[PDB]
Amino acid sequence: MSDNEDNFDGDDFDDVEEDEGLDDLENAEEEGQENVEILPSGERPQANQKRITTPYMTKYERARVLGTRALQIAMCAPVMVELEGETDPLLIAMKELKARKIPIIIRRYLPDGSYEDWGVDELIITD
């Protein structure tokens, strides 16, 4: 539709968005608990239109994101927060989450079949 949208080539973003949204441990559609995709915030989609869903990090997003970050540490990722007894990637993920040191984009699916970009930065966390 847009010039820099369809006629945009010459990009160098190295990443592979594989099938996501279906978590093995996280799966329970309920009010306030939407199915979302955990993506790494690379550019952070922005626009001149206000988002329509909730800018928060429910137990859903929190769990999905925690496991994601806990996976990063497992992959030899350094912690960006202090450890007051934490030593486990998840435990520490909670520390970083509560500290909002987790750079990630939460793609929440809409009941219509679409999705919305939600960066943790634009999300009001509850940890």
PDB file of all heavy atoms in Angstrom, residues 94-122:
ATOM      1  N   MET A  94      12.205 -12.575  36.230  1.00  0.00           N
ATOM      2  CA  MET A  94      11.198 -11.861  37.008  1.00  0.00           C
ATOM      3  C   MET A  94      11.780 -10.550  37.510  1.00  0.00           C
ATOM      4  O   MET A  94      11.118  -9.511  37.496  1.00  0.00           O
ATOM      5  CB  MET A  94      10.727 -12.701  38.198  1.00  0.00           C
ATOM      6  CG  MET A  94       9.511 -13.558  37.902  1.00  0.00           C
ATOM      7  SD  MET A  94       8.797 -14.300  39.385  1.00  0.00           S
ATOM      8  CE  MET A  94      10.143 -15.356  39.914  1.00  0.00           C
ATOM      9  N   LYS A  95      13.038 -10.602  37.935  1.00  0.00           N
ATOM     10  CA  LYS A  95      13.721  -9.422  38.436  1.00  0.00           C
ATOM     11  C   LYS A  95      13.854  -8.391  37.322  1.00  0.00           C
ATOM     12  O   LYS A  95      13.564  -7.208  37.512  1.00  0.00           O
ATOM     13  CB  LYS A  95      15.098  -9.798  38.980  1.00  0.00           C
ATOM     14  CG  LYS A  95      15.774  -8.684  39.756  1.00  0.00           C
ATOM     15  CD  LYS A  95      15.033  -8.370  41.042  1.00  0.00           C
ATOM     16  CE  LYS A  95      15.989  -7.918  42.131  1.00  0.00           C
ATOM     17  NZ  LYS A  95      17.079  -8.903  42.347  1.00  0.00           N
ATOM     18  N   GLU A  96      14.279  -8.855  36.154  1.00  0.00           N
ATOM     19  CA  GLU A  96      14.444  -7.986  34.999  1.00  0.00           C
ATOM     20  C   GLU A  96      13.100  -7.503  34.491  1.00  0.00           C
ATOM     21  O   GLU A  96      12.996  -6.397  33.973  1.00  0.00           O
ATOM     22  CB  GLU A  96      15.185  -8.713  33.881  1.00  0.00           C
ATOM     23  CG  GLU A  96      16.684  -8.485  33.893  1.00  0.00           C
ATOM     24  CD  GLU A  96      17.437  -9.566  33.151  1.00  0.00           C
ATOM     25  OE1 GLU A  96      16.823 -10.592  32.802  1.00  0.00           O
ATOM     26  OE2 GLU A  96      18.648  -9.390  32.904  1.00  0.00           O
ATOM     27  N   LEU A  97      12.076  -8.333  34.618  1.00  0.00           N
ATOM     28  CA  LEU A  97      10.744  -7.951  34.182  1.00  0.00           C
ATOM     29  C   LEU A  97      10.226  -6.822  35.061  1.00  0.00           C
ATOM     30  O   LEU A  97       9.799  -5.778  34.572  1.00  0.00           O
ATOM     31  CB  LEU A  97       9.782  -9.143  34.227  1.00  0.00           C
ATOM     32  CG  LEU A  97       8.356  -8.818  33.782  1.00  0.00           C
ATOM     33  CD1 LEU A  97       8.390  -7.746  32.711  1.00  0.00           C
ATOM     34  CD2 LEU A  97       7.645 -10.060  33.269  1.00  0.00           C
ATOM     35  N   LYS A  98      10.274  -7.048  36.357  1.00  0.00           N
ATOM     36  CA  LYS A  98       9.841  -6.055  37.337  1.00  0.00           C
ATOM     37  C   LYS A  98      10.658  -4.777  37.214  1.00  0.00           C
ATOM     38  O   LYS A  98      10.231  -3.700  37.625  1.00  0.00           O
ATOM     39  CB  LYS A  98       9.944  -6.616  38.759  1.00  0.00           C
ATOM     40  CG  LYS A  98       8.889  -6.067  39.708  1.00  0.00           C
ATOM     41  CD  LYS A  98       9.249  -6.315  41.168  1.00  0.00           C
ATOM     42  CE  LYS A  98       9.392  -7.800  41.480  1.00  0.00           C
ATOM     43  NZ  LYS A  98       8.126  -8.546  41.270  1.00  0.00           N
ATOM     44  N   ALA A  99      11.826  -4.918  36.634  1.00  0.00           N
ATOM     45  CA  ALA A  99      12.724  -3.799  36.417  1.00  0.00           C
ATOM     46  C   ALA A  99      12.545  -3.253  35.006  1.00  0.00           C
ATOM     47  O   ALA A  99      13.068  -2.192  34.654  1.00  0.00           O
ATOM     48  CB  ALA A  99      14.162  -4.221  36.661  1.00  0.00           C
ATOM     49  N   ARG A 100      11.778  -3.996  34.214  1.00  0.00           N
ATOM     50  CA  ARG A 100      11.494  -3.664  32.825  1.00  0.00           C
ATOM     51  C   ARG A 100      12.783  -3.556  32.012  1.00  0.00           C
ATOM     52  O   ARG A 100      13.061  -2.538  31.380  1.00  0.00           O
ATOM     53  CB  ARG A 100      10.656  -2.387  32.726  1.00  0.00           C
ATOM     54  CG  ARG A 100       9.301  -2.508  33.408  1.00  0.00           C
ATOM     55  CD  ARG A 100       8.475  -1.241  33.261  1.00  0.00           C
ATOM     56  NE  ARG A 100       7.804  -1.165  31.963  1.00  0.00           N
ATOM     57  CZ  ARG A 100       7.638  -0.037  31.271  1.00  0.00           C
ATOM     58  NH1 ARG A 100       8.112   1.114  31.737  1.00  0.00           N
ATOM     59  NH2 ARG A 100       6.997  -0.065  30.116  1.00  0.00           N
ATOM     60  N   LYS A 101      13.586  -4.611  32.084  1.00  0.00           N
ATOM     61  CA  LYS A 101      14.839  -4.689  31.341  1.00  0.00           C
ATOM     62  C   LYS A 101      14.749  -5.740  30.250  1.00  0.00           C
ATOM     63  O   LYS A 101      15.758  -6.164  29.694  1.00  0.00           O
ATOM     64  CB  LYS A 101      16.023  -5.007  32.261  1.00  0.00           C
ATOM     65  CG  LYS A 101      16.712  -3.777  32.821  1.00  0.00           C
ATOM     66  CD  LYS A 101      16.000  -3.244  34.048  1.00  0.00           C
ATOM     67  CE  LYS A 101      16.092  -1.732  34.124  1.00  0.00           C
ATOM     68  NZ  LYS A 101      15.081  -1.077  33.251  1.00  0.00           N
ATOM     69  N   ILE A 102      13.536  -6.150  29.948  1.00  0.00           N
ATOM     70  CA  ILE A 102      13.306  -7.149  28.919  1.00  0.00           C
ATOM     71  C   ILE A 102      12.824  -6.489  27.632  1.00  0.00           C
ATOM     72  O   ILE A 102      11.676  -6.051  27.541  1.00  0.00           O
ATOM     73  CB  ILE A 102      12.274  -8.221  29.350  1.00  0.00           C
ATOM     74  CG1 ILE A 102      12.773  -9.000  30.576  1.00  0.00           C
ATOM     75  CG2 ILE A 102      11.993  -9.173  28.193  1.00  0.00           C
ATOM     76  CD1 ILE A 102      12.034 -10.307  30.815  1.00  0.00           C
ATOM     77  N   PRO A 103      13.705  -6.372  26.630  1.00  0.00           N
ATOM     78  CA  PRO A 103      13.356  -5.796  25.343  1.00  0.00           C
ATOM     79  C   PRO A 103      12.668  -6.838  24.472  1.00  0.00           C
ATOM     80  O   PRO A 103      13.322  -7.697  23.876  1.00  0.00           O
ATOM     81  CB  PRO A 103      14.710  -5.388  24.737  1.00  0.00           C
ATOM     82  CG  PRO A 103      15.757  -5.793  25.733  1.00  0.00           C
ATOM     83  CD  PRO A 103      15.109  -6.773  26.673  1.00  0.00           C
ATOM     84  N   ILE A 104      11.349  -6.756  24.396  1.00  0.00           N
ATOM     85  CA  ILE A 104      10.569  -7.710  23.629  1.00  0.00           C
ATOM     86  C   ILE A 104       9.264  -7.089  23.153  1.00  0.00           C
ATOM     87  O   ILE A 104       8.727  -6.169  23.775  1.00  0.00           O
ATOM     88  CB  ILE A 104      10.295  -8.987  24.473  1.00  0.00           C
ATOM     89  CG1 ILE A 104      11.365 -10.037  24.188  1.00  0.00           C
ATOM     90  CG2 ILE A 104       8.911  -9.571  24.220  1.00  0.00           C
ATOM     91  CD1 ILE A 104      11.384 -11.157  25.195  1.00  0.00           C
ATOM     92  N   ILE A 105       8.788  -7.584  22.030  1.00  0.00           N
ATOM     93  CA  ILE A 105       7.551  -7.135  21.447  1.00  0.00           C
ATOM     94  C   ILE A 105       6.509  -8.233  21.592  1.00  0.00           C
ATOM     95  O   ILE A 105       6.710  -9.362  21.153  1.00  0.00           O
ATOM     96  CB  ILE A 105       7.740  -6.765  19.963  1.00  0.00           C
ATOM     97  CG1 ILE A 105       8.378  -5.385  19.853  1.00  0.00           C
ATOM     98  CG2 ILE A 105       6.419  -6.804  19.217  1.00  0.00           C
ATOM     99  CD1 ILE A 105       8.754  -4.999  18.444  1.00  0.00           C
ATOM    100  N   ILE A 106       5.414  -7.898  22.231  1.00  0.00           N
ATOM    101  CA  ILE A 106       4.340  -8.831  22.451  1.00  0.00           C
ATOM    102  C   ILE A 106       3.250  -8.588  21.446  1.00  0.00           C
ATOM    103  O   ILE A 106       2.562  -7.573  21.474  1.00  0.00           O
ATOM    104  CB  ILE A 106       3.766  -8.713  23.881  1.00  0.00           C
ATOM    105  CG1 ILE A 106       4.799  -9.159  24.917  1.00  0.00           C
ATOM    106  CG2 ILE A 106       2.489  -9.525  24.023  1.00  0.00           C
ATOM    107  CD1 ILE A 106       5.686  -8.040  25.410  1.00  0.00           C
ATOM    108  N   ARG A 107       3.118  -9.515  20.541  1.00  0.00           N
ATOM    109  CA  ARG A 107       2.123  -9.414  19.530  1.00  0.00           C
ATOM    110  C   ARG A 107       0.858 -10.089  20.021  1.00  0.00           C
ATOM    111  O   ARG A 107       0.789 -11.304  20.093  1.00  0.00           O
ATOM    112  CB  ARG A 107       2.636 -10.069  18.261  1.00  0.00           C
ATOM    113  CG  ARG A 107       1.886  -9.616  17.046  1.00  0.00           C
ATOM    114  CD  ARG A 107       2.725  -9.735  15.787  1.00  0.00           C
ATOM    115  NE  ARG A 107       2.835 -11.118  15.349  1.00  0.00           N
ATOM    116  CZ  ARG A 107       3.761 -11.573  14.498  1.00  0.00           C
ATOM    117  NH1 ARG A 107       4.671 -10.751  13.988  1.00  0.00           N
ATOM    118  NH2 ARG A 107       3.779 -12.854  14.163  1.00  0.00           N
ATOM    119  N   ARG A 108      -0.143  -9.303  20.350  1.00  0.00           N
ATOM    120  CA  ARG A 108      -1.391  -9.858  20.848  1.00  0.00           C
ATOM    121  C   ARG A 108      -2.340 -10.067  19.680  1.00  0.00           C
ATOM    122  O   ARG A 108      -2.494  -9.172  18.853  1.00  0.00           O
ATOM    123  CB  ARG A 108      -2.054  -8.912  21.853  1.00  0.00           C
ATOM    124  CG  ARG A 108      -1.198  -8.576  23.058  1.00  0.00           C
ATOM    125  CD  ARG A 108      -1.793  -7.419  23.843  1.00  0.00           C
ATOM    126  NE  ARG A 108      -2.675  -7.867  24.914  1.00  0.00           N
ATOM    127  CZ  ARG A 108      -2.318  -7.912  26.192  1.00  0.00           C
ATOM    128  NH1 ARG A 108      -1.136  -7.436  26.568  1.00  0.00           N
ATOM    129  NH2 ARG A 108      -3.151  -8.395  27.102  1.00  0.00           N
ATOM    130  N   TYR A 109      -2.960 -11.230  19.601  1.00  0.00           N
ATOM    131  CA  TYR A 109      -3.896 -11.507  18.521  1.00  0.00           C
ATOM    132  C   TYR A 109      -5.260 -10.910  18.839  1.00  0.00           C
ATOM    133  O   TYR A 109      -5.678 -10.884  19.997  1.00  0.00           O
ATOM    134  CB  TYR A 109      -4.055 -13.009  18.318  1.00  0.00           C
ATOM    135  CG  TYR A 109      -3.005 -13.653  17.444  1.00  0.00           C
ATOM    136  CD1 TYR A 109      -2.224 -14.696  17.925  1.00  0.00           C
ATOM    137  CD2 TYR A 109      -2.814 -13.242  16.132  1.00  0.00           C
ATOM    138  CE1 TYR A 109      -1.288 -15.314  17.125  1.00  0.00           C
ATOM    139  CE2 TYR A 109      -1.874 -13.851  15.326  1.00  0.00           C
ATOM    140  CZ  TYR A 109      -1.117 -14.888  15.825  1.00  0.00           C
ATOM    141  OH  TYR A 109      -0.192 -15.510  15.017  1.00  0.00           O
ATOM    142  N   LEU A 110      -5.952 -10.431  17.819  1.00  0.00           N
ATOM    143  CA  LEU A 110      -7.273  -9.864  18.005  1.00  0.00           C
ATOM    144  C   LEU A 110      -8.332 -10.918  17.702  1.00  0.00           C
ATOM    145  O   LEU A 110      -8.080 -11.846  16.935  1.00  0.00           O
ATOM    146  CB  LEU A 110      -7.467  -8.651  17.098  1.00  0.00           C
ATOM    147  CG  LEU A 110      -7.052  -7.305  17.691  1.00  0.00           C
ATOM    148  CD1 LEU A 110      -7.437  -6.180  16.746  1.00  0.00           C
ATOM    149  CD2 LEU A 110      -7.698  -7.106  19.052  1.00  0.00           C
ATOM    150  N   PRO A 111      -9.530 -10.798  18.306  1.00  0.00           N
ATOM    151  CA  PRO A 111     -10.633 -11.747  18.088  1.00  0.00           C
ATOM    152  C   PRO A 111     -11.098 -11.789  16.632  1.00  0.00           C
ATOM    153  O   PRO A 111     -11.858 -12.674  16.244  1.00  0.00           O
ATOM    154  CB  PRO A 111     -11.757 -11.216  18.987  1.00  0.00           C
ATOM    155  CG  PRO A 111     -11.074 -10.345  19.983  1.00  0.00           C
ATOM    156  CD  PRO A 111      -9.897  -9.751  19.271  1.00  0.00           C
ATOM    157  N   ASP A 112     -10.644 -10.826  15.838  1.00  0.00           N
ATOM    158  CA  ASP A 112     -11.012 -10.759  14.430  1.00  0.00           C
ATOM    159  C   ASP A 112     -10.057 -11.606  13.590  1.00  0.00           C
ATOM    160  O   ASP A 112     -10.385 -12.017  12.477  1.00  0.00           O
ATOM    161  CB  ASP A 112     -11.010  -9.307  13.935  1.00  0.00           C
ATOM    162  CG  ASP A 112      -9.618  -8.789  13.637  1.00  0.00           C
ATOM    163  OD1 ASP A 112      -8.711  -9.011  14.467  1.00  0.00           O
ATOM    164  OD2 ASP A 112      -9.426  -8.155  12.584  1.00  0.00           O
ATOM    165  N   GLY A 113      -8.876 -11.873  14.141  1.00  0.00           N
ATOM    166  CA  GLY A 113      -7.889 -12.667  13.439  1.00  0.00           C
ATOM    167  C   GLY A 113      -6.594 -11.913  13.205  1.00  0.00           C
ATOM    168  O   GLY A 113      -5.636 -12.469  12.665  1.00  0.00           O
ATOM    169  N   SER A 114      -6.557 -10.649  13.605  1.00  0.00           N
ATOM    170  CA  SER A 114      -5.366  -9.832  13.425  1.00  0.00           C
ATOM    171  C   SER A 114      -4.488  -9.850  14.675  1.00  0.00           C
ATOM    172  O   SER A 114      -4.598 -10.747  15.507  1.00  0.00           O
ATOM    173  CB  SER A 114      -5.772  -8.403  13.074  1.00  0.00           C
ATOM    174  OG  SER A 114      -6.423  -7.773  14.159  1.00  0.00           O
ATOM    175  N   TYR A 115      -3.623  -8.849  14.801  1.00  0.00           N
ATOM    176  CA  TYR A 115      -2.720  -8.739  15.938  1.00  0.00           C
ATOM    177  C   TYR A 115      -2.252  -7.292  16.093  1.00  0.00           C
ATOM    178  O   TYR A 115      -2.369  -6.495  15.160  1.00  0.00           O
ATOM    179  CB  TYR A 115      -1.506  -9.663  15.753  1.00  0.00           C
ATOM    180  CG  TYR A 115      -0.775  -9.475  14.438  1.00  0.00           C
ATOM    181  CD1 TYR A 115       0.017  -8.353  14.212  1.00  0.00           C
ATOM    182  CD2 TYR A 115      -0.872 -10.420  13.426  1.00  0.00           C
ATOM    183  CE1 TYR A 115       0.686  -8.179  13.018  1.00  0.00           C
ATOM    184  CE2 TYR A 115      -0.204 -10.253  12.228  1.00  0.00           C
ATOM    185  CZ  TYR A 115       0.573  -9.130  12.029  1.00  0.00           C
ATOM    186  OH  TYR A 115       1.236  -8.959  10.837  1.00  0.00           O
ATOM    187  N   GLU A 116      -1.719  -6.958  17.261  1.00  0.00           N
ATOM    188  CA  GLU A 116      -1.223  -5.624  17.525  1.00  0.00           C
ATOM    189  C   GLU A 116       0.169  -5.713  18.141  1.00  0.00           C
ATOM    190  O   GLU A 116       0.459  -6.647  18.893  1.00  0.00           O
ATOM    191  CB  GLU A 116      -2.173  -4.884  18.470  1.00  0.00           C
ATOM    192  CG  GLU A 116      -2.147  -3.380  18.290  1.00  0.00           C
ATOM    193  CD  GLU A 116      -3.376  -2.680  18.834  1.00  0.00           C
ATOM    194  OE1 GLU A 116      -3.940  -3.139  19.845  1.00  0.00           O
ATOM    195  OE2 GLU A 116      -3.753  -1.630  18.275  1.00  0.00           O
ATOM    196  N   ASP A 117       1.030  -4.765  17.799  1.00  0.00           N
ATOM    197  CA  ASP A 117       2.390  -4.734  18.334  1.00  0.00           C
ATOM    198  C   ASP A 117       2.389  -4.122  19.721  1.00  0.00           C
ATOM    199  O   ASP A 117       1.802  -3.066  19.935  1.00  0.00           O
ATOM    200  CB  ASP A 117       3.322  -3.924  17.423  1.00  0.00           C
ATOM    201  CG  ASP A 117       4.400  -3.174  18.201  1.00  0.00           C
ATOM    202  OD1 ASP A 117       5.480  -3.749  18.436  1.00  0.00           O
ATOM    203  OD2 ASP A 117       4.158  -2.006  18.584  1.00  0.00           O
ATOM    204  N   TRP A 118       3.004  -4.800  20.666  1.00  0.00           N
ATOM    205  CA  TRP A 118       3.086  -4.285  22.018  1.00  0.00           C
ATOM    206  C   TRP A 118       4.479  -4.438  22.588  1.00  0.00           C
ATOM    207  O   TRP A 118       4.867  -5.518  23.014  1.00  0.00           O
ATOM    208  CB  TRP A 118       2.111  -5.017  22.924  1.00  0.00           C
ATOM    209  CG  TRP A 118       0.693  -4.697  22.630  1.00  0.00           C
ATOM    210  CD1 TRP A 118      -0.188  -5.455  21.924  1.00  0.00           C
ATOM    211  CD2 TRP A 118      -0.004  -3.519  23.017  1.00  0.00           C
ATOM    212  NE1 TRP A 118      -1.403  -4.830  21.878  1.00  0.00           N
ATOM    213  CE2 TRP A 118      -1.311  -3.640  22.538  1.00  0.00           C
ATOM    214  CE3 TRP A 118       0.348  -2.375  23.733  1.00  0.00           C
ATOM    215  CZ2 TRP A 118      -2.267  -2.666  22.749  1.00  0.00           C
ATOM    216  CZ3 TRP A 118      -0.606  -1.402  23.936  1.00  0.00           C
ATOM    217  CH2 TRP A 118      -1.903  -1.561  23.444  1.00  0.00           C
ATOM    218  N   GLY A 119       5.223  -3.359  22.621  1.00  0.00           N
ATOM    219  CA  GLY A 119       6.542  -3.426  23.192  1.00  0.00           C
ATOM    220  C   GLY A 119       6.440  -3.322  24.693  1.00  0.00           C
ATOM    221  O   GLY A 119       5.599  -2.576  25.188  1.00  0.00           O
ATOM    222  N   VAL A 120       7.247  -4.085  25.422  1.00  0.00           N
ATOM    223  CA  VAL A 120       7.220  -4.043  26.888  1.00  0.00           C
ATOM    224  C   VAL A 120       7.311  -2.596  27.388  1.00  0.00           C
ATOM    225  O   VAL A 120       6.743  -2.239  28.422  1.00  0.00           O
ATOM    226  CB  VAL A 120       8.381  -4.843  27.512  1.00  0.00           C
ATOM    227  CG1 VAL A 120       8.199  -4.916  29.014  1.00  0.00           C
ATOM    228  CG2 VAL A 120       8.486  -6.239  26.908  1.00  0.00           C
ATOM    229  N   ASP A 121       8.037  -1.775  26.637  1.00  0.00           N
ATOM    230  CA  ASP A 121       8.216  -0.357  26.949  1.00  0.00           C
ATOM    231  C   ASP A 121       6.875   0.381  26.969  1.00  0.00           C
ATOM    232  O   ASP A 121       6.667   1.281  27.786  1.00  0.00           O
ATOM    233  CB  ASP A 121       9.162   0.293  25.934  1.00  0.00           C
ATOM    234  CG  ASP A 121       8.780  -0.019  24.499  1.00  0.00           C
ATOM    235  OD1 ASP A 121       9.086  -1.136  24.029  1.00  0.00           O
ATOM    236  OD2 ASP A 121       8.169   0.842  23.839  1.00  0.00           O
ATOM    237  N   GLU A 122       5.966  -0.018  26.087  1.00  0.00           N
ATOM    238  CA  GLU A 122       4.638   0.586  26.013  1.00  0.00           C
ATOM    239  C   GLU A 122       3.660  -0.196  26.882  1.00  0.00           C
ATOM    240  O   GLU A 122       2.463   0.084  26.902  1.00  0.00           O
ATOM    241  CB  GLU A 122       4.120   0.595  24.568  1.00  0.00           C
ATOM    242  CG  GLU A 122       4.480   1.843  23.777  1.00  0.00           C
ATOM    243  CD  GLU A 122       3.801   1.878  22.417  1.00  0.00           C
ATOM    244  OE1 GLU A 122       2.660   2.375  22.320  1.00  0.00           O
ATOM    245  OE2 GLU A 122       4.400   1.385  21.437  1.00  0.00           O
TER     246      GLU A 122
END
